Motif scaffolding. Sequence first.
Motif, short mmCIF file in Angstrom:
data_model
loop_
_atom_site.label_atom_id
_atom_site.label_comp_id
_atom_site.label_asym_id
_atom_site.label_seq_id
_atom_site.Cartn_x
_atom_site.Cartn_y
_atom_site.Cartn_z
N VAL A 14 0.83 -1.20 0.00
CA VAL A 14 0.00 0.00 0.00
C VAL A 14 0.87 1.25 0.00
CG1 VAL A 14 -0.22 -0.18 2.51
CG2 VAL A 14 -1.80 1.26 1.23
N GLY A 15 1.88 1.28 0.87
CA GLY A 15 2.69 2.48 0.98
C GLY A 15 3.49 2.77 -0.27
N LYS A 16 4.13 1.75 -0.83
CA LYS A 16 5.03 1.96 -1.96
C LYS A 16 4.27 2.38 -3.22
CE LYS A 16 7.36 -1.31 -3.75
NZ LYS A 16 8.19 -2.53 -3.91
N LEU A 17 3.07 1.82 -3.44
CA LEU A 17 2.23 2.32 -4.53
C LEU A 17 1.86 3.78 -4.30
CD1 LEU A 17 1.76 -0.88 -4.95
CD2 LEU A 17 -0.44 -0.20 -5.93
N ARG A 18 1.52 4.14 -3.07
CA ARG A 18 1.22 5.54 -2.78
C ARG A 18 2.42 6.42 -3.07
NH1 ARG A 18 -1.30 8.04 2.93
NH2 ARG A 18 -1.81 10.09 2.06
N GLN A 28 -7.89 6.04 -2.15
CA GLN A 28 -7.84 5.96 -3.60
C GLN A 28 -6.89 4.87 -4.08
OE1 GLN A 28 -5.19 6.92 -5.85
NE2 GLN A 28 -6.46 6.31 -7.59
N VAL A 29 -5.97 4.42 -3.24
CA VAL A 29 -4.94 3.49 -3.71
C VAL A 29 -5.61 2.23 -4.27
CG1 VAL A 29 -2.92 2.17 -3.09
CG2 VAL A 29 -3.28 4.40 -2.05
N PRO A 30 -5.30 1.80 -5.49
CA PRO A 30 -5.91 0.58 -6.03
C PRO A 30 -5.68 -0.63 -5.13
CG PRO A 30 -4.31 1.61 -7.56
CD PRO A 30 -4.80 2.63 -6.61
N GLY A 31 -6.62 -1.58 -5.21
CA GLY A 31 -6.50 -2.85 -4.52
C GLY A 31 -7.30 -3.91 -5.25
N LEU A 32 -7.11 -5.16 -4.82
CA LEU A 32 -7.83 -6.28 -5.42
C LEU A 32 -9.26 -6.33 -4.90
CD1 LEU A 32 -5.07 -9.01 -5.29
CD2 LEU A 32 -6.06 -8.08 -7.36
N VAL A 33 -10.21 -6.49 -5.82
CA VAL A 33 -11.63 -6.45 -5.49
C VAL A 33 -12.17 -7.87 -5.45
CG1 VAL A 33 -13.90 -5.84 -6.45
CG2 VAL A 33 -12.12 -4.09 -6.24
N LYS A 34 -11.96 -8.62 -6.53
CA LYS A 34 -12.41 -10.01 -6.59
C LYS A 34 -11.55 -10.75 -7.61
CE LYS A 34 -16.02 -8.77 -9.88
NZ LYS A 34 -17.05 -9.39 -10.75
N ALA A 151 -8.18 -0.50 -9.82
CA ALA A 151 -7.40 0.40 -10.65
C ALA A 151 -8.29 1.10 -11.67
CB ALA A 151 -6.29 -0.36 -11.37
N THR A 152 -7.92 2.35 -11.99
CA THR A 152 -8.68 3.15 -12.94
C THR A 152 -8.18 3.00 -14.36
OG1 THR A 152 -7.23 5.03 -12.44
CG2 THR A 152 -9.30 4.86 -11.21
N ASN A 153 -6.92 2.60 -14.55
CA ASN A 153 -6.35 2.39 -15.87
C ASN A 153 -5.39 1.21 -15.79
OD1 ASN A 153 -4.10 3.37 -14.60
ND2 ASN A 153 -3.96 5.26 -15.79
N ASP A 154 -4.65 0.97 -16.87
CA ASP A 154 -3.83 -0.23 -16.95
C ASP A 154 -2.57 -0.13 -16.10
OD1 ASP A 154 -5.59 -1.49 -18.70
OD2 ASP A 154 -4.61 -0.62 -20.47
N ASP A 155 -1.89 1.02 -16.13
CA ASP A 155 -0.58 1.11 -15.49
C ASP A 155 -0.70 1.00 -13.98
OD1 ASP A 155 -1.71 3.48 -14.83
OD2 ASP A 155 -0.13 4.76 -15.67
N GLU A 156 -1.72 1.64 -13.39
CA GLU A 156 -1.94 1.50 -11.96
C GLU A 156 -2.21 0.05 -11.60
OE1 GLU A 156 -5.05 4.21 -10.97
OE2 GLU A 156 -3.79 5.99 -11.16
N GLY A 157 -3.05 -0.63 -12.38
CA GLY A 157 -3.25 -2.05 -12.18
C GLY A 157 -2.00 -2.87 -12.47
#
Lengths: 169, 126, 137, 48, 72
Positions: A14-18, A28-34, A151-157
């Motif tokens: 979580v921290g390093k992505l932020r 807002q930080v992306p995470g796994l949903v399902k 994630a909102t786009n590909d690179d964040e995911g």
Amino acid sequence: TTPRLKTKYREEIVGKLRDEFSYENVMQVPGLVKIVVNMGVGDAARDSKLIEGAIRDLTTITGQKPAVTKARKSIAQFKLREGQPIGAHVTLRGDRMWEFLDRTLSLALPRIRDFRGLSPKQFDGRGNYTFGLTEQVMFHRGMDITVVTTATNDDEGRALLRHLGFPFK
Amino acid sequence: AYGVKIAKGKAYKGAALKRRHIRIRKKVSGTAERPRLVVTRSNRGITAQVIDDIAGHTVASASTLDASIRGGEGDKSAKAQQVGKLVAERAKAAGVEAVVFDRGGNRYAGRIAALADAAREAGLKF
Amino acid sequence: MLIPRRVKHRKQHHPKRSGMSKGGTQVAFGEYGIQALTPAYVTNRQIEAARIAMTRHIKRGGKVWINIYPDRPLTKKPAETRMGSGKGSPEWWVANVKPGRVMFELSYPNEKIAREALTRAAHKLPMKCRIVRREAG
Amino acid sequence: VRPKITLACVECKERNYITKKNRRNNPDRLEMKKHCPRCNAHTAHRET
Amino acid sequence: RNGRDSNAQRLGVKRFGGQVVNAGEILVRQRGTHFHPGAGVGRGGDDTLFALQAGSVQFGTFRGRKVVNIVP
RNA sequence: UAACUGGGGCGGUUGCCUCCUAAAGGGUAACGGAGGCGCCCAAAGGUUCCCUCAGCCUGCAGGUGUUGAGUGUAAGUGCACAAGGGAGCUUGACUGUGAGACCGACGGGUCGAGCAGGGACGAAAGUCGGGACUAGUGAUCCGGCGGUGGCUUGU
RNA sequence: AGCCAAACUCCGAAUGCCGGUAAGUAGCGCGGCAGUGAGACUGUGGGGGAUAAGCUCCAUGG
RNA sequence: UCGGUGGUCAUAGCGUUAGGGAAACGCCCGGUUACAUUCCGAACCCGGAAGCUAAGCCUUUCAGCGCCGAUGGUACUGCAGGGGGGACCCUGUGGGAGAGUAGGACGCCGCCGA
């Protein structure tokens, strides 16, 4: 017992992505949903018994009872009639999702023959990932892995999947 | 009213509840003899008012913001018992005996059953 | 020769002929045009005969637009048949042209040849026609 | 194909209602419950 | 192979605005709900609109849809 | 040993439902222009609860998409508040009635509040006297079957 | 970008129709007795016919 | 100054631009039981209050798409007349659109609770 990947996510990922994307708010930080695993036995139109084996396998690999899908439309070329079963799927969430993700990535994924890595371009353009599996014996018929993130786009995911350890080319 | 649209990802809870609320309001109207008894179910507390849609005015009202409930012991389910009792009292006061309950879109169980029962033992006929 | 490749109803009423044109009263594509002055039905044969007249006269260059299309079916019963026993099969395809409609359009460098070609077409048509020039809006 | 059946319960032995029912779809003698006016009850009327 | 028709049904509005009616009179005969039932107006089995209470007929738009209304 | 019929015969049609002609209430003819019906469903009925589609784009999943999908069955009027889709429970596809009305020359066709009995669903308000609506049918005479016990030649 | 449509309509009159009311000058119920139920032309809105007929079939006036 | 519930049903919408957390609403973290998933506490249901306005929600800029829209005229038309070989055309009196133009518009009106 919180799964290893669930933990690793909460403390370190979580921290390093932020830090990498410089997000103002943590939520807002992306995470796994399902995690949804799909299997489509189109041959089942010819033999309904085949699906029974499919339920057994899927039950074994993930630990939930698949839900068998029925033909939504009748297609002549595939002699498909509406209402007959054609496949099974499972939607995993929470710890079971995290536990399954640990198993596939750390154990089954290297067992791909001639595996140089899974392609990084297989995103759907919204931050959700998909890659198909050609054989079932990979786990200690082809089945599709679909990873649904926040994630909102590909690179964040893609960044999130990187940091979770998926072997992208 | 004329229903609302559908939603995507977030705001699906809000839209679905509102869409469900309209479904319930196509057969439950606020008359003059028996007013409407809307009951909103939030995360913090539970409010319930006695509306007169034919006129548009509200007759009685009670919620968790009132002193009688604002701060005290008990979980939500038992916390709605106070809200049920007062609104029954505030309805009896302003000449009301029979009212039409409506869920508000949420299902009839838990607090909504509990609130209904508390209001129903206080005299009001559902 | 112009025919609709597909039409929903083969048997239709006679398209009425009162009033002026709804639109298409002014030159739109080309530089010159044929404007009708009286109502009539112009059959697909009549349009073809007029088109050959213009194109043959200019003989090269220039471009001709046909603003109307004969898509209304007219019917005729077999000859020497008594009245009754249904409607006849479609024979002629007609465009319902009203007064004011610009039927044909033509662009050409030479004005004199343009007018001559337009006049030759008019004498193949069943109504009174006038030559109109594109107004510089 | 769809013949007219005559329903009857086990008490009044009076033919109350008649209805249509596809033979081949419901070969088993059809049955349901009605208001018998003789009995004045919501008994079960087995198809005759 | 033409020449077939169904004899007329006499649909349409049977009581217009400002017309005093008694409870149960037919207000509209229609196919489908071209007009919806409003206050004091009921729907029959075949979309028929009939007054539930005596009053004057009045048309309007309630909740974004044309309705009939009876005003006591 | 029928009639209609732009003379008659030949050919075609005869009842019901939807649309247009039909001239913005209703009705309105032709051997005028297009089609359907002589059923089906034990759920494709009732009720309670829940859901929104077609199409398009991206790699079962995601974004978009308010009606362009669907509505057993022709067309039309409606239905996205769903009357469309999915589950739970059921049999109101009731018995005794019909304030008041619509359409027909008439016979007749259609809708229907409220009440009682005895039930289904729902916590409740309430809805349920078959189906989203309009076709799926046939007067009387004669006779058959089940029920009930009213009555006919002295008793 | 310019167009066409009885069975297309985002729109949409004039008239006509239903009811209320004011002013001005026949209507209805119940019975006895009928005839009529082959229409014609002309104005207007249409269908069939061929942008025919002193044609034919409708609607609305004379 | 915000939350709940209504009326009109786009002059309200869509999109775009800048923000908000005092109570409130929501996100939100958990599944012990009641309750549930054609599989999944994602949804419903249950119990709280760690973090947060990032999204929803509310406020705000823009007439950009969509939406509304005169007056005048015209088509058309009731009644009454003309004209033309015919298809059809014209006028007096009464009524009068559709399209388009000038413009409007980033909603408005109630009841409660904080």
